[PDB]
Amino acid sequence: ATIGRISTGSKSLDKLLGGGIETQAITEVFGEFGSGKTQLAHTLAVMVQLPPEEGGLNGSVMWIDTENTFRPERIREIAQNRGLDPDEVLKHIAYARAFNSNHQMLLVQQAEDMIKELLNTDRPVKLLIVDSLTSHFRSEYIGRGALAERQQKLAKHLADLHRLANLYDIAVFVTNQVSATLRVYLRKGKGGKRIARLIDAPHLPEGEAVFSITEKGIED
């Protein structure tokens, strides 16, 4: 299938990314507290439900939350400020809390079931979010005696996610803190704006995009 792209809500950021985040790819967004990475996740979970003309893929969402950062009220706000029905938008985000790193890996394995069910419907899964990719791994695998296993498990987890992305034409979006992934780094800019910097993309030039966080989620 042709690679599809989901608008981030920001024209500037979309331009940096070659049009939006890609299906058949993992986009990995880094940022310190308040960087905007979870706001970007929330915005994408709304945008993907729009038709292509409006920057979406007429899709459903699956969301794995490791640290209780998903806010349904924020989804409702972004949805309504963009013209969608807030209840319908929430209904099409399948939510799962991951309690630990093993559970997180199991959930990705389990997600395939729902992806298969929705695949040839009017709302196939088009976005799978893991927020955040590493919080449990960081918490559980302490020190050098644990590094080897941590990297192995994380590598397997990323491979599972890549497989879902490629096989089912899904954009995988994961957050992290400092290929395989398209890495974007968020930071505070001037006057409450945020800056995204794209780094080490094989076929997109590095660059920066400045964006805002509003009641619409993120936009220029």
Ligand X SMILES: Oc1ccc2ccccc2c1
Binding-site residues from annotation for ATP: 31-38
Q: What is the DSSP string of 146-202?
A: HHHHHHHHHHHHHHHHHHHHHHHT-EEEEEE----SEEEEEEE-STT-EEEEEES-S
Are 186 and 39 contacting, i.e. CB atoms less than 8 angstroms apart? Answer: no
> Closer to ligand X at the Cβ: 129 or 186?
129
Closest-approach residue to ligand X (CB) = 96
CA 30 to chain centroid, in Å, comes to 11
Minimum gap (Å) between residue 160 Cβ and ligand X: 11
Minimum gap (Å) between residue 92 Cβ and ligand X: 12
> Closer to ligand X at the Cβ: 10 or 60?
60
Minimum gap (Å) between residue 164 Cβ and ligand X: 10
Q: What distance in Å separates the CA atoms of residue 85 and residue 154, rounded to the nearest whole number?
A: 37
> Closer to ligand X at the Cβ: 157 or 194?
157
Sign of CA dihedral 59, 71, 213, 64: negative
Strands 25-30, 21-22: pairing kind: unpaired
**What residue numbers does the annotated binding site cover?**
31-38
Minimum gap (Å) between residue 104 Cβ and ligand X: 9
According to DSSP, the residues that pair with 199 across neighbouring strands are 183
**Residue 75: enclosing H or E segment and its boundaries?**
helix 72-81
User: Helices (DSSP H) in 23-71: which residue ranges?
Assistant: 37-47
Minimum gap (Å) between residue 143 Cβ and ligand X: 30
> Closer to ligand X at the Cβ: 127 or 186?
127
Q: Helix, strand or coil for residue 125?
A: strand
> Closer to ligand X at the Cβ: 118 or 186?
118
Residues that bind ligand X (CB under 6 A): 62-64, 94-96, 107, 110-111
